Amino acid sequence: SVLAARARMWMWHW
Amino acid sequence: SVLAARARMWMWHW
Amino acid sequence: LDKSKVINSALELLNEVGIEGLTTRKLAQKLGVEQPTLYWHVKNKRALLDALAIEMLDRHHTHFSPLEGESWQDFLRNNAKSFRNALLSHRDGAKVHLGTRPTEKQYETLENQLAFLTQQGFSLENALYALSAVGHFTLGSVLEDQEHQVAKEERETPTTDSMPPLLRQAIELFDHQGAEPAFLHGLESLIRGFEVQLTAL
Amino acid sequence: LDKSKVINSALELLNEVGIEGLTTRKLAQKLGVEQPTLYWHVKNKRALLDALAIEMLDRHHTHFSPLEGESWQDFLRNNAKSFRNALLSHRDGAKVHLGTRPTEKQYETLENQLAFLTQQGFSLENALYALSAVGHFTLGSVLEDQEHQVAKEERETPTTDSMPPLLRQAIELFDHQGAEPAFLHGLESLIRGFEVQLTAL
Ligand SMILES: [Mg+2]
């Protein structure tokens, strides 16, 4: 699960 | 109370 | 029941009880449904917090996107200001937004922020860094002032202080001028420093 | 019972249960003392969080004070870097420091910061706002880092996350670098901003 680890990457939200 | 009013004003902490 | 109704009643519950009182359990009671019915709309409290933060942005973050004809300095200043309005729209609003993950419905907006800042001369890395810094500064400014408002009522008033003069003049100035001016001054300093970096490159 | 025993057990309890778990009732239980024995050392949760914040500064805030001979830029950069390490030192560390306040025992340090900046040419007002901005950015940085670490373990993996390309490149870059480069770049933008402003005056 490379896809699961990508989904845990931080994303800003503003 | 001046002392009381000052103690309530924000002070940084770093 | 639809997701809009769940979000609106959860935002009403957030203002009544605060973030620590915001449970799937009291939300169900408020909607007249059993607790397991909510699972399908929000699987756990972090999914509920993410939806509440994104609804506050969809209502109040009027400068989420760059607007036609704005300079990159007016977009970053205005973005921080309307993000602050979204954080202040509800009790414990900034605590709810911490650690939020956008959904795919927000990706066009975020891609457009980075297309705009790279069209306006930033590298993709420095456009990420500028957006990161404006929002982190805004979250820290709102959370510190909102916490100070509560914490100042929980300390006992001292009989003694003994405060040195520059420090007493500084805290008196900050209080007179207000925390919103302080936020705008720091925001401006960030913008001025992004401009110095863009020039030097 | 000693202040050092109360503070170290409370910081262990903080790492076990997080900030909302940390109550004077549970700390007295942990220490094996009745609530009135603890009250003599810690009156309420606001006094306990103020004391934990100062303990974390005493351990990790190596640049609370300017060093003799140091440039104002190096001081502000090193001060934010060490304050970041104090906030990162414990679970929910940034939330523990939010809204705290120095004791009289720290006033001389704060006075010295101001004396230093004003010697180097800042107005009192702009020294106050430079200190305020660097600490608010650092608090916002770590509040979001810490909450992302919690949140990313709570959220279910989406089936397919169809992300546009500049956004995917930007989140992959941040992940590869970790939080520190973006933090340092934001901090350097603030310092460049203050230098523009100072040179101007
Ligand atoms: Mg938590």
Side-chain angles (χ1 to χ4, degrees), chain C residues 20 39 43-44 46 50 95 97-101 104 106-108 110-111 114-115 118 124-126 128-130 132-134 136-137 139-145 147-148 150-152 154-156 158 160-171 173-174 177-178 181-182 185-190 192-194 196-197, chain D residues 20 39 43-47 49-50 95 97-101 104 106-108 110-111 114-115 118 124-126 128-129 132-134 136-137 139-145 147-148 151-152 154-156 158 161-171 173-174 177 181-182 185-190 192-197:
Chain C
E20 283 315 310
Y39 177 80
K43 286 202 190 196
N44 55 21
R46 170 29 86 167
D50 292 336
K95 298 184 178 186
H97 283 251
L98 285 168
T100 290
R101 174 45 158 86
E104 77 281 337
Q106 285 71 56
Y107 290 175
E108 179 173 19
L110 300 163
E111 186 79 358
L114 295 173
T118 57
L124 176 72
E125 175 177 79
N126 288 331
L128 161 71
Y129 293 167
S132 178
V134 180
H136 285 105
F137 174 72
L139 277 163
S141 293
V142 168
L143 286 157
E144 178 69 15
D145 171 65
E147 209 79 357
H148 173 63
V150 171
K152 75 192 183 170
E154 307 171 325
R155 301 193 181 96
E156 266 99 72
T160 213
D161 99 32
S162 187
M163 187 176 304
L166 291 174
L167 176 59
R168 178 186 41 73
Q169 288 165 49
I171 69 169
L173 182 65
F174 190 98
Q177 289 183 349
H185 279 250
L187 178 57
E188 209 69 11
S189 293
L190 276 171
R192 290 190 309 267
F194 295 153
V196 171
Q197 189 199 15
Chain D
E20 295 89 357
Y39 176 83
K43 294 278 178 286
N44 66 3
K45 180 178 182 164
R46 161 54 36 208
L49 295 169
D50 290 345
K95 280 174 173 181
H97 284 249
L98 204 51
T100 61
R101 179 181 196 84
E104 297 97 307
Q106 287 79 45
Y107 292 174
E108 179 174 34
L110 271 75
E111 188 74 2
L114 301 169
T118 57
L124 179 55
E125 174 187 51
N126 288 324
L128 165 65
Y129 292 138
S132 180
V134 296
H136 283 103
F137 172 65
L139 281 158
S141 293
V142 178
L143 285 160
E144 179 69 13
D145 185 5
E147 199 62 16
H148 173 65
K152 72 190 191 181
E154 299 169 328
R155 194 188 274 132
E156 78 193 319
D161 190 358
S162 296
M163 198 176 292
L166 297 177
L167 177 59
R168 177 73 75 184
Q169 181 181 358
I171 73 174
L173 183 69
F174 192 93
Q177 293 183 351
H185 203 268
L187 176 58
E188 205 70 15
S189 301
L190 283 174
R192 287 166 181 145
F194 301 152
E195 283 191 323
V196 170
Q197 154 190 70

Side-chain angles (χ1 to χ4, degrees), chain C residues 63 71 76-77 88 90 100 108 115 126 142 164:
Chain C
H63 290 90
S71 65
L76 295 178
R77 196 185 297 105
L88 291 175
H90 291 75
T100 290
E108 179 173 19
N126 288 331
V142 168

Side-chain angles (χ1 to χ4, degrees), chain C residues 19-37:
Chain C
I19 188 174
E20 283 315 310
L22 177 82
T23 203
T24 112
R25 10 331 156 106
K26 263 129 81 169
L27 178 59
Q29 281 195 303
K30 180 192 270 303
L31 290 164
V33 301
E34 307 282 358
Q35 291 188 43
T37 296

Side-chain angles (χ1 to χ4, degrees), chain D residues 39-108:
Chain D
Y39 176 83
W40 303 120
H41 298 266
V42 181
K43 294 278 178 286
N44 66 3
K45 180 178 182 164
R46 161 54 36 208
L48 176 63
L49 295 169
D50 290 345
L52 298 188
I54 280 163
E55 181 66 20
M56 289 182 243
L57 301 180
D58 288 341
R59 293 178 180 188
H60 301 286
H61 195 21
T62 51
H63 289 271
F64 201 170
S65 297
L67 303 181
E68 209 166 358
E70 198 171 36
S71 71
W72 68 256
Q73 296 98 327
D74 283 352
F75 166 55
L76 288 178
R77 195 184 298 103
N78 293 335
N79 180 276
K81 288 173 68 179
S82 71
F83 179 42
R84 176 173 179 271
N85 287 341
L87 298 186
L88 287 171
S89 67
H90 288 74
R91 177 172 175 188
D92 295 334
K95 280 174 173 181
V96 170
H97 284 249
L98 204 51
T100 61
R101 179 181 196 84
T103 70
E104 297 97 307
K105 163 79 169 335
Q106 287 79 45
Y107 292 174
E108 179 174 34

